[PDB]
Design a protein around this ligand. Sequence first.
Ligand code: FES
Ligand code: FES
Ligand SMILES: [Cl-]
Lengths: 164, 160
Amino acid sequence: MKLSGGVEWALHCCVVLTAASRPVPAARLAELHDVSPSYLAKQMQALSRAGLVRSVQGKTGGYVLTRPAVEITLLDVVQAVDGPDPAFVCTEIRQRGPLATPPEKCTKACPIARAMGAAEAAWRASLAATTIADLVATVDDESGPDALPGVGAWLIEGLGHHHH
Amino acid sequence: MKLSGGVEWALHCCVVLTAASRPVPAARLAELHDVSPSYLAKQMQALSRAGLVRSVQGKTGGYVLTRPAVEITLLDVVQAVDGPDPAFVCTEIRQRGPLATPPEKCTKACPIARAMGAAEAAWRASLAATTIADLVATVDDESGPDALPGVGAWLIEGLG
Ligand code: FES
Ligand code: FES
Ligand SMILES: [Cl-]
């Protein structure tokens, strides 16, 4: 397996967007991270299709979180970018072949499917129990409390952006 | 995210090979769930590379598990087919751009990478805590003690 490369970018974007008190265009996000604007926009559009961000149209426009960081799980972002399917999907192979279990006798899920299900559930539990807000709190703890507000200022800056 | 389809087949394979008392001919093993010989060869290459299934040559030849069901975890089989690669790869994007974290302040992993590595490790830990023997016992419990022996007898029977 390989999680989509976009997951890492999308997570970083959600975290910095928490410090932005105005909409932030894609180009500004891309410049912070020194990455292709068109690359980063595709990831932001994934977040937007999943309802986690929205593109403010018109003047002073750009991306905003559509709900508070504390209501955005890592699982939300991963599914938005990498896709909602579980890693393992049972195609009922016990029903194919010359010893096939009749579908009438397959009321319960295959024990193999259930065991893979249990593992998926552990993955989802760990991602669901952590939010953008928790990542922000770890950053404040490790980088200090001025780090993310400083990034946020840089992201929302107007004309001063061109005089560093 | 998505594992290979080989994973479902491979886990079923390891379960039924526990019930076989002789080597299982390639043709019968392929027949069990109607897959082509090419498809079989690929999965058995993977299980062989991971040390889980062995070929025994000769006239009554075939495949056998290399070790008892109790010593084969779901993680062993999943990594045999899908590979051992971490699903989440950190590319140190925090070290890019005009407000880059300097390399000296990147002694520890990025908080984001830590959260993602942690979740992946919970998935691995769950797969590692369950064995092919636990699945065999659950099958015997739910399908009845004759189900798997019936399959193993079918796999090894000399004539068709
Ligand atoms: S029938 Fe799908 S995992 Fe067993
Ligand atoms: S630098 Fe890779 S996840 Fe933050
Ligand atoms: Cl670390």
